[PDB]
Design a protein around this ligand. Structure first.
Ligand SMILES: *[C@H](CC(=O)Nc1ccc(C(=O)N2CC[C@H](Nc3nccc(-c4c(-c5ccccc5)nn5ccccc45)n3)C2)cc1)CN(C)C
Length: 355
């Protein structure tokens, strides 16, 4: 297993099977290169994490995502072809390389391509399949947005990361690009506490964006985000508001009361194909599902299991993908403990050596 070094902005030491390294982006966790794997005969993406153990946030993210790849195994979630380090001992250990099949684009790039119903409904289906698989493994993503999701030109899709640990003191973030509130569920903006269907809200916002071509709830701060939500969906019920913490409830109950816009005006026929018997049906189904995902009160928001059975999605439904439990449930207790930087180094190195 001899290595080759190639400077690509920084410097990439990789097994020689990986040829033609080309930069294609920069992740929160490090530099991504495209490459060709001459052993497998396929294009791959190669990501280098430099000293993931140096920073605590980077350590918990590197460690939990290494472990989670042993818990999940699903076509719509990142799975790794290879994990390696070029350093030969624990204490010269610095760099972890992750290898997966090369994806063509991120979802943030497909937003402006005005997809038809067949492609929109297939992307939605795959998102729901991956999320159901993540939930079954004990993972609520909590930070799904267009940039967390990559696609190939054949419209296949993978959720790229495992989201936000509950014990993340970093609120709701990590940065390839500009941190935004656009996809965060209202219960999260309001400080309420969250359940799994926070991920359904995010998927609704993404689906709305690919229908409309623009961001559905484009708040410019925490306060403006809530306003953009109630302006379009209506002020939620008194029960929901009463359950807020008094200071939040005081502010929220004092806003202008909005009635909400019917989804037939929010998502009218003219932003959909809608131009045939078949497309009028699909448009009605798409809008009905949107009206069940984009629901402020999480107790009335559709679940992933329910969304997966929706008529808009049936053309794609395949139990081999939609009813596919994960190899293991994640044991989070080990990620929540303190761990010094040198403990993280050992923990990460061990996982790297398990490959
Ligand atoms: C707007 C979007 C924008 O302006 N620019 C932009 C957005 C996304 C991308 C991108 O994500 N791409 C293009 C090719 C890349 N292919 C690919 N394939 C597989 C994996 C990755 C990848 C990995 C990774 C993980 C594990 C092993 C190997 C690789 N990690 N990351 C992190 C970030 C991005 C990709 C990636 N990539 C996908 C390019 C340009 C958004 N704005 C509105 C917020």
């Amino acid at each position: 297993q001899f290595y080759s070094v190639q400077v690509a902005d920084s410097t990439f030491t990789v097994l020689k099977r990986y040829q033609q390294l080309k930069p294609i982006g920069s992740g929160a966790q490090g530099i991504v290169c495209a490459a060709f794997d001459t052993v497998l005969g396929i294009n791959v993406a190669v990501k280098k994490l430099s000293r993931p153990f140096q920073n605590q946030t980077h350590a918990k993210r590197a460690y939990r995502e290494l472990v989670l790849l042993k818990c999940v195994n699903h076509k719509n979630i990142i799975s790794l072809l290879n994990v390696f380090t070029p350093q030969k001992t624990l204490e010269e250990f610095q760099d972890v390389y992750l290898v997966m099949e090369l994806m063509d684009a991120n979802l943030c790039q497909v937003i402006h391509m005005e997809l038809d119903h067949e492609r929109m409904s297939y992307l939605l289906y795959q998102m729901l399949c991956g999320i159901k698989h993540l939930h079954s493994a004990g993972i609520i993503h909590r930070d799904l947005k267009p940039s967390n999701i990559v696609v190939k030109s054949d419209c296949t899709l993978k959720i790229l990361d495992f989201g936000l640990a509950r014990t993340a003191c970093t609120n709701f973030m990590m940065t390839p690009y500009v941190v935004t509130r656009y996809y965060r569920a209202p219960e999260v903006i309001l400080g309420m506490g969250y359940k799994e269907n926070v991920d359904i809200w995010s998927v609704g916002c993404i689906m709305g964006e690919l229908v409309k071509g623009c961001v559905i709830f484009q708040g410019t701060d925490h306060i403006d985000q809530w306003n953009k939500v109630i302006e379009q969906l209506g002020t939620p019920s008194a029960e929901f508001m009463k359950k807020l913490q008094p200071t939040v409830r005081n502010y929220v109950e004092n806003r202008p009361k909005y009635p909400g816009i019917k989804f037939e005006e929010l998502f009218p026929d003219w932003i959909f194909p809608s131009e045939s018997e078949r497309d009028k049906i699909k448009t009605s189904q798409a809008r009905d599902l949107l009206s069940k995902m984009l629901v402020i009160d999480p107790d009335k928001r559709i679940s992933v299991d329910e969304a997966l059975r929706h008529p808009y999605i049936t053309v794609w439904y395949d139990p081999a993908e939609a009813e596919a439990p994960p190899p293991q449930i994640y044991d989070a207790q080990l990620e929540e403990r303190e761990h010094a930087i040198e403990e993280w180094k050992e923990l990460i190195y061990k996982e790297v050596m398990d490959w």
